[PDB]
Symmetry: C4
Subunit: 388 residues, 4 copies
C-alpha cells in the first residue's frame, strides 16, 4: 500500500444524495443494541465504517438509565462497517469518551481519550498497537474532534483542546506519523474557541470548521499547513450562520474575523466546506434546539462577510424531529474527492423523558453532481414503544 496524499480536485456537487441509514433506535426495542452518542463515519480505501462512543451498555439494560453523561470510565470507541448497527458482536477499539480516527492509506489510527476531567490521558493507537499517549495540558477535560482526522503523505493531523467549555481554552494541533506525535503546533489567528472540528483535506492542506462554545454563533475556521505545521484560524463569512443556539436569519452576522457574539455560548458539532467562494453548509433547522436539519449553498459565503443569499437547500431531517451533532467525511473517486456528511439523530433524556437512557442513530448523505429529489429521513422510533 501507499499513504494517501488526497491530491485530486474536489468534485463539483449539486447537493447531496442519501447514502446510509442505520435505524439503531428502532431496532433497540427488539434487539440488544449499544447505547451510543457522538458518532462519526470514515473510510479506509476500500470501504466505510461507522464509529460512535458507546456507553458501556446496551439499550434494554438497567445500566442504560442515566446515560445523559458524556464522561464515564466505560465509554469505548465502537467501530462497525457502514450500515451494520452496533450489536453485541461490535468491537470496542479502545477506551474513549472522546475520539477521532483516520486511515493514512496504510492503516487506521484512533486517538482515544479517557481519564479524570482534571487529568486525562489520550492514547494514540496505530495499526492495532498502542504507539504513544499524552496527558491533559490544561487540566480541564482534554477533548478531541469526535469525527475523522486527516492524513497526507503519512502524517495525520488531529486537533485537540483542553480548558474551559465556555471561556478561554487551549487548542493544539497534533501531527502524528504512524501513531507517533511528531509535532505539536498551537492555534493561531482570530478564532476564539475551538471545540470538535470537522476537518477535511484541501491538498496540500487540511481545513476545519468547528464549534465556538463560548462567544460564537458563527463557526471558527482552522487552517492547517502540513508543509510547516503552520496554523491559522478565522470564522466563516456567511451571515447565514450554522451553530445552535443561533440568532435568526435576519439578525445574524459574521465578518469572517471575530465571534459574532450573537448567542455564542453553547454549540453543537457541525460542518461546512467551501467551493470557490461558495459555502456548502448544514445545520439543525432550529436555532434554539437540535431539531430538523437542512443543508444549502450560500453563494459568496466563503469570501464575502455577512453573505446570506442561499440556493440549493435540502431538508435531510424535517423541522419537527430530533437532530444533533454532525460532521464531514471525504471519500476519493476515480477523478475527484467527494464530501459527505452524517447527522446524529439523538433520542432519550433531556427532551424525551418517558425514558432514562440517551442514545442516537444516524443517517448519511454524500455530494452528488447529479439530480436528486426530496425527503426527510428521521430516526423514526415511536418513543412509547421503546424500553424503560
Amino acid at each position: 500500500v501507499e499513504y494517501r496524499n488526497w491530491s485530486k480536485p474536489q468534485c463539483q456537487i449539486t447537493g447531496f444524495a442519501p447514502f446510509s441509514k442505520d435505524n439503531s433506535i428502532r431496532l433497540s426495542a427488539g434487539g440488544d443494541i449499544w447505547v451510543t452518542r457522538e458518532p462519526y463515519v470514515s473510510c479506509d480505501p476500500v470501504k466505510c465504517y461507522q464509529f460512535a462512543l458507546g456507553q458501556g451498555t446496551t439499550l434494554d439494560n438497567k445500566h442504560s438509565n442515566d446515560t445523559v453523561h458524556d464522561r464515564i470510565p466505560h465509554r469505548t470507541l465502537l467501530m462497525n462497517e457502514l450500515g451494520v448497527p452496533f450489536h453485541l458482536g461490535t468491537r470496542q477499539v479502545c477506551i474513549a469518551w472522546s475520539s477521532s480516527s483516520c486511515h493514512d492509506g496504510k492503516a487506521w489510527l484512533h486517538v482515544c481519550i479517557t481519564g479524570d476531567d482534571k487529568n486525562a490521558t489520550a492514547s494514540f493507537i496505530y495499526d492495532g498497537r498502542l504507539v504513544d499517549s499524552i496527558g491533559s495540558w490544561s487540566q480541564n477535560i482534554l477533548r478531541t474532534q469526535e469525527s475523522e482526522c486527516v492524513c497526507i503523505n503519512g502524517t495525520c493531523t488531529v486537533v485537540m483542546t483542553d480548558g474551559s467549555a465556555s471561556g478561554r481554552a487551549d487548542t493544539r494541533i497534533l501531527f502524528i506519523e504512524e501513531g507517533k506525535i511528531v509535532h505539536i503546533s498551537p492555534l493561531a489567528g482570530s478564532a476564539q474557541h475551538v471545540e470538535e472540528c470537522s476537518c477535511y483535506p484541501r491538498y496540500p492542506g487540511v481545513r476545519c470548521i468547528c464549534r465556538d462554545n463560548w462567544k460564537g454563533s458563527n463557526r471558527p475556521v482552522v487552517d492547517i499547513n502540513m508543509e510547516d505545521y503552520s496554523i491559522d484560524s478565522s470564522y466563516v463569512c456567511s451571515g447565514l450562520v450554522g451553530d445552535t443556539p443561533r440568532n435568526d436569519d435576519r439578525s445574524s452576522n459574521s465578518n469572517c474575523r471575530d465571534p459574532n457574539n450573537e448567542r455564542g455560548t453553547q454549540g453543537v458539532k457541525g460542518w461546512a466546506f467551501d467551493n470557490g467562494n461558495d459555502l456548502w453548509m448544514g445545520r439543525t433547522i432550529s436555532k434554539d434546539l437540535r431539531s430538523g436539519y437542512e443543508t444549502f449553498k450560500v453563494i459568496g459565503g466563503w469570501s464575502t462577510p455577512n453573505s446570506k443569499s442561499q440556493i440549493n437547500r435540502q431538508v435531510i431531517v424535517d423541522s419537527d424531529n430530533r437532530s444533533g451533532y454532525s460532521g464531514i467525511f471525504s471519500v476519493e473517486g476515480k477523478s475527484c474527492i467527494n464530501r459527505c456528511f452524517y447527522v446524529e439523530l439523538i433520542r432519550g433524556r433531556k427532551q424525551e423523558t418517558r425514558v432514562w437512557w440517551t442514545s442516537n442513530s444516524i443517517v448519511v448523505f454524500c455530494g452528488t453532481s447529479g439530480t436528486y429529489g426530496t425527503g426527510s429521513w428521521p430516526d423514526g422510533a415511536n418513543i412509547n414503544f421503546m424500553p424503560i
Copy 2:
C-alpha cells in the same frame, strides 16, 4: 479481475433442483430477525448473496405493527450471504424502498431509491462509494426492478419506471458504467406497462420479463441491446400466462404483441426465460391470490402465440400456502450459464390477521440438466406461535 461479458451458452435445464431456504419467519418467533419484503438474490463471481428491503425493524418489535406499506423513510437494502438470515449483524447497504444490484465482475453496484413518491431520488452506489443519482422524472413513485440488474463488459443496465401504477407510465432503461449513468434509452415496442423486470443476460444482450400492472395478464418482454442502447418490448406468447390476477387456463390468451386485457390491472413480480422456442416459466398456482407456486415448460411458448401445451411442471410451494414475488438470477458454470429463481413466501397482514406485521422468507431453486423429484417447500411458520 475482469468485467463479465457472460458469453457462453445457456445450460439445457431439465427442471429445477432445490438450492437454498432461509426460514426467517420460523426463527423470528425465537430470535431477533428483520421485517423484510421484496427480496432478491444475486451473486458475485465466487458466491451468492440474498437481498431484501427491510422495514427498519425486527419482527418482535412494537415498530413491526403496520409494516404493510411499501414506502417509509426507514426501508434500507439488506445484504447477506445466501443462507444466512437477516439477523442484527446484517448490513444495511443503503436507504432504499426500491432496489436492484448486480456485480460487473469487478465490484457490486446497487441502485437504491427513497424519497417522497412525488419527488424521490435514486442513488447509484458503486464499490462502496456514492457515484451518481437521479430524481423522479414523472413525479409519481420512481421505482426499479426489485431483483438483479445485469452487466456485460463493464456496463450495467437497470430499467426503471415512474408514473401511474394502473395507467400509462414512463419506463426508462439506464446504462451505468462504474456507478456513472452513461446513457438513458426510453422503452420502445408494444409493451403497455413495465414494472419490476426480471432480467437476465442473453449475450450479446439482456432480456427482461416484467409486470403489466395496468392492462396485462400476459407479461411484457423488454429486450435491451447493449451494442447501441436500442430497446424493444413485446409480450410472452404462451397462452398459459403468468401474472396474478390471471384469467383461467382455458380462457387466457396472448398474441405476443398486446396486453391481453384479461384481468390486466394489478400484478406481482415474476419471471420466465426462453430456450429455443420454449418458455421456462413460474407462477403462483392461484390466479386470484399469491398462493402456491408451480413451474413448467411451455412447448412453443416463446414463439407461437397462445401456445398452451406444457410439459415438466413442478410444485415448489403447494397450492394452499402463501407465495408472492419472484425473480430470475443467473450463475455462470464451467461451460454454460444456469438460470435460477427465488420466491418470496410472504406472511402477516392482508391475508393473515392474527398479526400486524408483514414480512416473508425465501426459497430458491436452480436449473438442473439432471434428475429430480417432488416436494413443496413452504414458509412453514405456525402463525399462532408467532409474536403479535
Copy 3:
C-alpha cells in the same frame, strides 16, 4: 490450489485426545441456538467446520415442539467453524434432511437431500453453485452418509442408499468430480444393509464402516476403489461389535462375512477404522440405548473373526449420560493423516420428556500418538433449567 490425494501413512495413534466441545444445549437455555441433529465435522485444508441438519428453528421457539422427526421441508444443512455454535448468524448452506460434505482440496462439495420420501431429489452443490442432482431410484427415502465424503485427485465418492430401512435396499456409490456425477457403481460383496457410512481415505482408496439397520449388529464394511469404481462389502471381524442394539460382550459374534443376525434390526451411525490387523472403534457403552460412549482397540479385530481381546479403552461420555450418532473425519499432518471422531450428544424427546423439542450438541476427539488421561465430557445441560 491442488486437489487432495491424501497420500501419506495413517498416523500411529495411542488413543484419542479431546479436541472441541460446543455446549449448544447448555447455551440454548440462555440464547437463540438452532435445533439440530445428525451433526458431522469436516475440514478444508486450513481449518475444520461443524455441520448439522437444523430443524428450521431455534430452541426457545414454539416451532421447536415436535422436532422428533427426521424429515420436514425446513431442515437445511448448517455450517460453522469448529467451535462456534449454531447461532442466528449461522448459514444454511442448502435445503437438506440428509447430507454429506467434503472438500476436494480446491472447494467444498455438499450433497443435500430433501423432498417427499417417495420421490426426493438430491442436489449436488459445488463451490457455491448447483452443479447436478438426482431423483430417488427406489422411491423410499433416498438418504446419504450424514458425515464427511472423501475425495482423491478431484473425485469425491459419496455413497447413498434408497429402499427399506429394515429390509433390502439399494445402495449406490457415487463418483462426483466438481459437482458432476461422473459415475455410479452399485454395492457389491456380502454386506446386507448399508446406511449412513462413516468413510475415510486409505490411499489409493476409500473405506467405509456403516450401519446395518436390518439384520446386523456387526458393522458392514464398504471398500471403494477409485481406480476403477469397483466396490466390495463385508463386515468387521471384531466379536466385540459396535451397533446398538448390540447383543452382549460374551454373546456377540462376527465372522467378517455375514450380518451376525444378533439383534440386527435398528442401529445408529458409528465408525471404526483399521490399523494393521487392529481395529480402533467406538460405541455407546449401552447395547440397548444410546448412552455413554467408550472407545478401544481390538487386537486382531480387523483380520480375525470374533476377536474380542481389547486394549486401550477410553470413556468419552460416561455410561449414564446420552450418546447418539458418531462418525470419523481425517485431518492431514506434516507427515501422516490422523483420524478423529465426533459424537452426537442428543437431548429432548424420546428419552427426556419434560420437553417437546429434540436437539443435541457435540464433542470431538482426535487420535494422538502421545499420552492422555481420563474424563467424561457429556452434554451437561440440566434438563429442568431448559425451555418448554
Copy 4:
C-alpha cells in the same frame, strides 16, 4: 511468513496508557454473554485477541448458578478479537479448564487442559489440528500458565505444574515446535512453588514471574534458556512484594532467593518485568482480597533485595472495586517491544452474593514512553441490576 525471534530491545516505558476495556459484566444484563474467568490477551503479528475459559454457558442462563468452580467438563477456551466481547458467535477453540496460547509468527498454538484432577490430559493443538498431548505426571490437577506462552525461532516454551496447590509440586517446562513436544526440562533453582507464570521474551530467552501458592508472598522468577533448555528460578527482589495475601509495606521482605514465608499460602496470578535493575510491577492494592489495582516502578527492585523505593505508581482500578488475576503480554514495535498487561475484574459469588454466578470482564493497559494522566477503570456493573 517467518517465525518470531523477538530480537529488538524492550521499549523504555514511562508508565501505562489505557488500551482496551470490554464491559462484559455490564452488557450481560442486556444481552447473551459468556460466563468466563481466568482471561488473558495475546496477539498474532497483525492484531490482538482476548481469551478466557468460559463456563459452558451464558450469564442469563440457569446453568450459570454455581460457576464458582474452576473445573468442569464444559470449560472451553474462548478466543475473540481484542475488544469484541464473548457473545454467542464466539468460538470455543478447544475443551480446556486451564490454558495458554501464543503465535510462533506463523500460526497459533493453544495448550488446553481438561480431565479428572487425578488424571487429566493436555492437548497441544497447532494451526487448527491436534498435534500432541500429555497426561498428568503427578496425578494432582495438571495446570498451566493461564496467559500467553512465548516462542522464538519456532519453539514455544510453555511451563506447567502438577502436584499440591499448597505444598510441593512438579513444575516442568515444555518446549513445543509446531504442536510437537520436542523437549521437557524440570524446574531448577530456588523457587518453592510455581503456578500460573506470566512470561515474556528477553532475547535470547524467556522470563517468567509466577505465583507461589505455598510459602511465598514474594513472586518466583523462572528463567528459561532456549539455547539449551536450561532453567533457573529465584524470587523478585523488591521488598514491596506483589502476591495477595501480602504482608504489609513496612513488614514485607524478599532476599531474591527464598519464599519470604510471609503469608505465603494462597495467591493470585500476577506479573512484573524488569528494566535495568528496576522492576515494573502490578498488584491488587489490597493485601487481603483482590480489590483495586495499582502499578509502579521499584527503583532497584530487580537487583537489590528488599528494595522498597517506588516511583511512577498508577491506579488502574480504585481500591474499593474488584480486581483479580492479571498477566503480561508483549507486542512488537517498529523499533522495540512493548509490554502490556490485562486485569481480570471478577464479579459474582464469593464476595458478591446477590447472585449465584461468577464471571468477570477485563481492562488492558500498555507501556508508553509518553505522558499520561489519571483514572480508575473498574467493571462498573450495578450488581443489583444484574440477573439472578
